[PDB]
Amino acid sequence: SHMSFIKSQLPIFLNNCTQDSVINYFQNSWELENILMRSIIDDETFYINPDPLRNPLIFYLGHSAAFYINKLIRVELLEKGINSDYEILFEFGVDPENAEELNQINWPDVRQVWDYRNKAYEVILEVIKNTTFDLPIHASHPLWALMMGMEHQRIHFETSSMLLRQLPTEKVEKPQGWQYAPSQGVPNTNKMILVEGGTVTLGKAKDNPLYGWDCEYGDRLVKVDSFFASQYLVTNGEFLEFINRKGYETQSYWNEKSWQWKEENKVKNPKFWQFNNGKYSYRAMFDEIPLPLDWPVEVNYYEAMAYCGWKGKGTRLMSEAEWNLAAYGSNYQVDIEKVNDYNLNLKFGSPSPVGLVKTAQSHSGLWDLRGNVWEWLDENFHPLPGFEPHFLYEDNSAPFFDNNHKMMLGGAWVTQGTETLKYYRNWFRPNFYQHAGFRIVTNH
């Protein structure tokens, strides 16, 4: 039916974060990332940076482990680290504007970084077993460091999965039980649905009993006018029509910045398509397969907007407030079990046909607002009123309130943890590739 053999534990309310439940959730966070890292066949592949805007894979093998250690030291739950050189080397990731910036380090051996991981795992597990979990946990409790570490690791499962997908298939091995969604399927008609206007409140209250990142908090009331939105995410088959109507070759659908990006990278189609013998194949995590015509297309923001340009007629993307209104209405009590109703949390090992998951239609009538692939939004990443950086990670989001990052919401098939729930806010530079697609909007 769907992926079952590789299983991801649902997140836990801070009022239920018992020592036993957290041990299980920590072990699961870490085992999942181990399964992903073990899919690289040859240790020399760890010195490749398959995405030219991100670090070599060796860095991501050590990074999630160093992050836990650094934050437990900062709250004084650990009195010393495991390797101070590695805790520096693996500390900070990257967000360059171009490949040259990043290109401009002696990495350790792969076996030395696995050793570091295994030692860190045992040190953290002992902290967990030796600390009292006085419920409830909260943002001024030292164990917030541990909750932050587990979510950071699950976020890096998702962003590392995109790096492994950019390696040649011959360099990776599919883990036992990895299961893609059914792919045969021509898409259904993608109808425009009227979403009735109303008021939404964005943000998260300080004492909400769920872990979250600083940029999730605050309070913003927004009056949202009615709008039309496509009931499905734009599919591979819809986007193939744009390609066949010279979408990548027509300047008027683009703008100068996005056209420059397209030309510089010689782009003729979405990143994970290849044209051979008269037809497109598609690169799933570990295998090439015939293009799944009814799955959501995966594009960066530039490509999403070019398709909007081809549609014409004021076609555009949703704002953050518009997505929230469509997904959650005007209400809200999170029900964590509802994550099972969407293509989230490794329900599948890939995107799914739009509409296949029959529980995934929001009350507004739109399908896969939650799950399947993130959806891009026409919204510069920005703080909500009441935003405050957290002492444990002051630079988490504030550097990126710079009008150079667009938002995306709702989670993908690969998304885990509190990132699958209502409050998480995601953001990327508009040229970046994620497990991410879009739907189209018109005012009238």
Ligand X SMILES: C[N+](C)(C)[C@@H](Cc1cnc[nH]1)C(=O)O
Footprint on this chain of Fe ion (rule: CB under 5 A) = 93
How far apart (Å, rounded) are the C-alpha atoms in residues 369 and 248? Answer: 27
| Binding partner of residue 338 among ligand X, Cl ion, Na ion, none, CB cut-off 5 to 8 Å per kind | Cl ion
236 binds ligand X (CB under 6 A): no
| Binding partner of residue 410 among Cl ion, Na ion, Fe ion, none, CB cut-off 5 to 8 Å per kind | Na ion
How far apart (Å, rounded) are the C-alpha atoms in residues 115 and 121? Answer: 10
| CB 187, min distance to Na ion, A | 16
| Binding partner of residue 217 among Cl ion, ligand X, Fe ion, none, CB cut-off 5 to 8 Å per kind | none
Q: Which CB sits closer to Fe ion, 332 or 391?
A: 391
Q: Give the amino acid at 285.
A: M
**Token output for 42:** 């040859």
Among 52, 93, 136, 177, binds ligand X (CB under 6 A): 93
**Token output for 156:** 């890096």
Whether the CB-CB separation of 421 and 339 falls below 8 Å is answered with yes
Q: Which residues in the 140-159 window bind ligand X by CB under 6 A? A: 152, 155, 159
DSSP letter for 93, please. Answer: -
338 binds Cl ion (CB under 5 A): yes
**Binding site annotation covers 156?**
yes
Whether the CB-CB separation of 297 and 238 falls below 8 Å is answered with yes
SS3 per residue for 109-168: CHHHHHHHHHHHHHHHHHHHHHCCCCCCCCCCCCCHHHHHHHHHHHHHHHHHHHHHHCCC
Cα–Cα–Cα angle for 55, 153, 403, rounded to 5 degrees: 60
| Binding partner of residue 426 among ligand X, Fe ion, Cl ion, none, CB cut-off 5 to 8 Å per kind | ligand X
| CB 394, min distance to ligand X, A | 13
Enumerate the β-bridge partners of residue 200.
222
Q: Write the binding mask 355 to 394 for Na ion: x where contact by CB under 5 A, - elsewhere.
A: -------------x------x-------------------
Biggest CA pair distance of the chain: 63
Whether the CB-CB separation of 414 and 161 falls below 8 Å is answered with yes
Query: For 11-143, where are the alpha helices, taking DSSP H only?
Result: 19-37, 57-74, 84-89, 99-103, 110-130
**14, 262, 319 from 254: Cα distances, Å:** 46, 9, 20
334 binds Cl ion (CB under 5 A): yes
How far apart (Å, rounded) are the C-alpha atoms in residues 406 and 14? Answer: 30
Part of the chain binding ligand X (CB under 6 A), chosen from 41-49, 124-132, 246-254, 421-429: 421-429
**Binding site annotation covers 405?**
no
Q: Which CB sits closer to Na ion, 273 or 342?
A: 342
| CB 407, min distance to Na ion, A | 12
**Binding site annotation covers 435?**
no
Q: Write the binding mask 171 to 210 for Na ion: x where contact by CB under 5 A, - elsewhere.
A: ----------------------------------------
Part of the chain binding Cl ion (CB under 5 A), chosen from 254-262, 334-342, 343-351, 363-371: 334-342
How far apart (Å, rounded) are the C-alpha atoms in residues 275 and 265? Answer: 16
| CB 375, min distance to Na ion, A | 4
Q: Which residues are annotated as a binding site for Fe(3+)?
A: 63, 152, 156
What residues make contact with Na ion under the rule CB under 5 A? 368, 375, 410
What residues make contact with Cl ion under the rule CB under 5 A? 334-335, 338
What residues make contact with ligand X under the rule CB under 6 A? 93, 95, 152, 155, 159, 426-428
Q: Which residues are annotated as a binding site for Mn(2+)?
A: 63, 152, 156
Q: Which residues are annotated as a binding site?
A: 63, 152, 156
